[PDB]
Amino acid sequence: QVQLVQSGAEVKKPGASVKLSCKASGYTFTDYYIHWVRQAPGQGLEWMGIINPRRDTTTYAQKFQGRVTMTRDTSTNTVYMELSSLRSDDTAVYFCAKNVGFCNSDSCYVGMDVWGPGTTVTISSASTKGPSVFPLAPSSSGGTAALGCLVKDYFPEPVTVSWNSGALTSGVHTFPAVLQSSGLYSLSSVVTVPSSSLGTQTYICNVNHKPSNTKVDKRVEPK
Amino acid sequence: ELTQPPSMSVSPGQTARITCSADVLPKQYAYWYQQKPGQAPLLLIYKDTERPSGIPERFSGSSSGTTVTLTISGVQAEDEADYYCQSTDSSDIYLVFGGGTKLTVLGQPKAAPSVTLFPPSSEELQANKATLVCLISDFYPGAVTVAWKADSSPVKAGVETTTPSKQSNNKYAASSYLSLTPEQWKSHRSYSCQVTHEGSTVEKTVAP
């Protein structure tokens, strides 16, 4: 089976460069072109360019000529895409995709049959900061009560939140984070539990922010 | 450039017809892709009319002059997604995508938002900060407005609200955060988060 594996999320400051990787397997690497396509948040797909790994030749969309470089390594069946002088407009998910057809003198069809999962690239002036975590204590909602954790002022995404180290799965709702005008993120995780267990079962949110290599366990108790 | 409608609605079981148009299509093959939020596109149709292995026959493609059309038959809820056409420019070299068509599958029941409002925690107040947290879930359709008040008076400053986002049960959620000093928080008898959805309002109140 054809698989394309892409490098993890990148966070960059304006003016920097980023080099993304696309590792291909399950087919003959030098028989097919590789495309790069990007998608800014909420927007449509935009083709960036194409590389032929056999001959190491490239072509880029007009708007990316001069600031994109695609390269390849046949020893590892890997393609690379480097984008320079990053701006806020370059925040997007970047996909690689295998060309649908084998191209020769008798036939060349250019479309994408297998896509990689996408590498998220976020351009921001903010600096890495672990969250401050606070309990959202329940109060007064029939036979169930809502308690939560507030995860305040962190950067960059993502954070994960689990409850009781992963034992508690049912009733958990982690909300999408808000991006504040300070450039920092906040989010809330809330778990809905029977109203009687308050006082009988303990509730602990485990916040994990790998980009800052911080974990926080916070007990949420009634007031 | 490739033109397709930004949006289209259809009822379960009906047939969807997404068209894409450009001067160059008589001379260039087109390709159709499906994309579901947070996922990689999936090739549905290539060389105008051929369907890969693994794609169901409900999806078919046709060409006519300067248009190409993707047809989906027996639309099911799981066909809700963005559909993109792709071809090549008048340059005959550079690939271009259409703007994409969001396919809505009608029939989702409307639903008023549930609102939870949390006051500042003790710990935060000791750190000389105060944040009110208004969490909004299980509503459909996915548009809401949030208004904050302190003691009958609207508060606009210090408000941060997310865009509505779709939950796992196909309803929507959003959250709003009100940042205050501990002095403002203690200065008022109450604070309220008011969520408006489809002409009606749900309001929660907290107090120090």
Binding site: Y33, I50, N52, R54, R55, T57, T58, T59, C103, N104, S105, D106, S107, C108, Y109, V110 | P26, K27, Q28, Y29, K47, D48, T88, D92, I93
Partner: peptide, 15 residues
């Protein structure tokens, strides 16, 4: 009348 050998082929496999 649909072009069956894409121009990118000549751009990319020429050296």
């Amino acid at each position: 009348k649909k072009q069956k050998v894409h121009a990118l082929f000549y751009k990319l496999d020429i050296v």
